[PDB]
């Protein structure tokens, strides 16, 4: 009555190394020994420094339609202006000193910790490039270099902390008997295609895997028959997911007994995920506006269907992918940096102008001498956007009010911003668009 595994291998197993070579050869390990002790010291002090200053936060994430606080605490450090979205939650970088950077005030050591993980970034990048080089050499032996450079060009690291003591609510691994999970089976999302990932692991201080020691687990996608690998991690071990590993396999993190930090360096796919990018989108939308002076008499250059559609889509993007994402996190990074404070003021102001634009379009649609054909063209151009705007607003209000969110501290409690009451003359349109959307449809049905 024995079947395909339902089991896992560790180094305690003879088959371990050969299974590693045959079924997970794009997973690479570099033991703590291969990293200079000086770098170890700076990186671990930087972990503890960011921990004492309270810079790591559990994210109020979303999964299969459920609001869930993560057991693990996190901070995103990386290129200025860059974001990384996972589980419907866009993390904004705490900036690190990339060349030609602006020294935006931060707590004393905080900036020095960010500088440190930049240093670790450079290092791991060198290692990753070396390993992909070696990997290709094997490839050509048995059977571009710009591709390598870019698949290793880490623009962010996502730091994680868990204390299994003060966070004892951990799920059991369901397929292979690997025990307690800090992070369940997953692929890392929103990374550049075929990009590598590098993880520096930092633990503080018989059948199957040792439950007291931290491991990273690996399995093949769709496959619980091939035995999973449970890799032991100690103080300063590094692992690397190369090439298509992250796509073809899943990984998890198995909890040990002691606290542990990790630094997971990534090539975030940020083509719609940078400040410069969303600023350019806002400028594009506002091209349709007469911009001599900034005031409330917003007047539009064209009502061509395509230009209005584009404008209302950009309105949506800045509102929900940026403003609401930033403020849903209650301004926690204000604890680490001020970098995003002016950028978010400026995006909020660009957004307010856009509430202005929408209003202008709604006045036009209701205009006396407007041939009903052109009117119908406008409605059909904008209706999808306005309806998606209304639904996404209902969802963010709720997500800000969930019973789980109200239980967060005052430093991290969500902020449903921007938000205004119906008795607010400062804003040209109501927050609740259901009336407006209904009317627009009733018209499009009109004989
Ligand atoms: O800490 C580690 O060794 C590895 N960390 C992660 O692999 C990791 N990556 C992602 Cl994208 C998520 C995403 C959501 C929750 C946990 C994650 C996680 O632990
Ligand atoms: Zn992961």
Swiss-Prot record:
Transmembrane region(s): none
Please share the entry's free-text remark on the cofactor: Binds 1 Fe(2+) ion per subunit.
Note the subunit structure. Monomer. May also exist as homodimer.
User: What outcome follows a substitution of residue 74 to M/W?
Assistant: Almost abolishes enzyme activity
Name the UniProt key words of this record, in alphabetical order. Answer: Acetylation, Cytoplasm, Dioxygenase, Disease variant, Iron, Metal-binding, Nucleus, Obesity, Oxidoreductase, Phosphoprotein, Transferase
- Please give the Pfam families that the UniProt record associates with this protein: FTO_CTD, FTO_NTD
Positions of the UniProt region annotated as Loop L1: 168-179
Record-level Gene Ontology MF annotations: broad specificity oxidative DNA demethylase activity; ferrous iron binding; mRNA N6-methyladenosine dioxygenase activity; oxidative RNA demethylase activity; transferase activity; tRNA demethylase activity
Question: Where would you find this protein in the cell?
Answer: Nucleus; Nucleus speckle; Cytoplasm
Residues recorded as binding 2-oxoglutarate, renumbered to this chain, are 160, 239, 260-262, 264, 266
Q: Where is this region: Fe2OG dioxygenase domain?
A: 10-271
The tissues in which it is expressed are: Ubiquitously expressed, with relatively high expression in adrenal glands and brain; especially in hypothalamus and pituitary. Highly expressed in highly expressed in acute myeloid leukemias (AML) with t(11;11)(q23;23) with KMT2A/MLL1 rearrangements, t(15;17)(q21;q21)/PML-RARA, FLT3-ITD, and/or NPM1 mutations.
Cofactor (UniProt): Fe(2+)
Q: Which residues bind Fe cation?
A: 186, 188, 251
- What function does the entry list? RNA demethylase that mediates oxidative demethylation of different RNA species, such as mRNAs, tRNAs and snRNAs, and acts as a regulator of fat mass, adipogenesis and energy homeostasis. Specifically demethylates N(6)-methyladenosine (m6A) RNA, the most prevalent internal modification of messenger RNA (mRNA) in higher eukaryotes. M6A demethylation by FTO affects mRNA expression and stability. Also able to demethylate m6A in U6 small nuclear RNA (snRNA).
In the UniProt entry, the disease listed is: Growth retardation, developmental delay, and facial dysmorphism: A severe polymalformation syndrome characterized by postnatal growth retardation, microcephaly, severe psychomotor delay, functional brain deficits and characteristic facial dysmorphism. In some patients, structural brain malformations, cardiac defects, genital anomalies, and cleft palate are observed. Early death occurs by the age of 3 years.
Protein name per the record: Alpha-ketoglutarate-dependent dioxygenase FTO
Domain writeup: The 3D-structure of the Fe2OG dioxygenase domain is similar to that of the Fe2OG dioxygenase domain found in the bacterial DNA repair dioxygenase alkB and its mammalian orthologs, but sequence similarity is very low. As a consequence, the domain is not detected by protein signature databases.
């Amino acid at each position: 009555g024995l079947v395909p595994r339902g089991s896992h291998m560790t180094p305690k197993d003879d088959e371990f190394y050969q299974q590693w070579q045959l079924k997970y050869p794009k997973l690479i390990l570099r033991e703590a020994s291969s990293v200079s002790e000086e770098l170890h010291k700076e990186v671990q002090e930087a972990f503890l420094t960011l921990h004492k200053h309270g810079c790591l936060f559990r994210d109020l994430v979303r999964i299969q339609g459920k609001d869930l606080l993560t057991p693990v605490s996190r901070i995103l450090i990386g290129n200025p202006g860059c974001t990384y979205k996972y589980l419907n939650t866009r993390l904004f970088t705490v900036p690190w000193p990339v060349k030609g950077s602006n020294i935006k005030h931060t707590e004393a050591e905080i900036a020095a910790a960010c500088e440190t993980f930049l240093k670790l970034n450079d290092y791991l990048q060198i290692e990753t490039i070396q390993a992909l080089e070696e990997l290709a050499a094997k490839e050509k032996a048995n059977e571009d270099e710009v591709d390598i450079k870019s698949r290793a060009a880490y623009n962010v690291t996502l730091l994680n902390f868990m204390d299994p003591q003060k966070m004892p609510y951990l799920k059991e691994e369901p397929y292979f008997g690997m025990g307690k999970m800090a992070v369940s089976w997953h692929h890392d999302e929103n990374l550049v295609d075929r990009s590598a990932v590098a993880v520096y692991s930092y633990s503080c201080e018989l059948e199957g895997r040792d439950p007291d020691i931290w491991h990273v687990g690996f399995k093949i996608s769709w496959d619980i028959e091939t035995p999973g690998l449970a890799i032991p991690l100690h103080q300063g071990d590094c692992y690397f997911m190369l090439d298509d590993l992250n796509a073809t396999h899943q990984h998890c993190v198995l909890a040990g007994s002691q606290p542990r930090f990790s630094s997971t360096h990534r090539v975030a796919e940020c083509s719609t995920g940078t400040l410069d990018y969303i600023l350019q989108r806002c400028q594009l939308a506002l091209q349709n506006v007469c911009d001599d002076v900034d005031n409330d008499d917003v007047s539009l250059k064209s009502f061509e269907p395509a230009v209005l559609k584009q404008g209302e889509e950009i309105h949506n993007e800045v509102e929900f992918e940026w403003l609401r994402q930033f403020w849903f996190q209650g301004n926690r990074y204000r604890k680490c940096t001020d970098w995003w404070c002016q950028p978010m003021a400026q995006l909020e102001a660009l957004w307010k102008k856009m509430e202005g634009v929408t209003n202008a379009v709604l006045h036009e649609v209701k205009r006396e001498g407007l041939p009903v054909e052109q009117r119908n063209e406008i409605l059909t151009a904008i209706l999808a956007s306005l309806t998606a705007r209304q639904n996404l607003r209902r969802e963010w209000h709720a997500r800000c009010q969930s019973r789980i969110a109200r239980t967060l501290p005052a430093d991290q409690k969500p902020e449903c911003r921007p938000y205004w009451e119906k008795d607010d003359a400062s804003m040209p349109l109501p927050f609740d668009l259901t009336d407006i959307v209904s009317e627009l449809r009733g018209q499009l049905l009109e004989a």
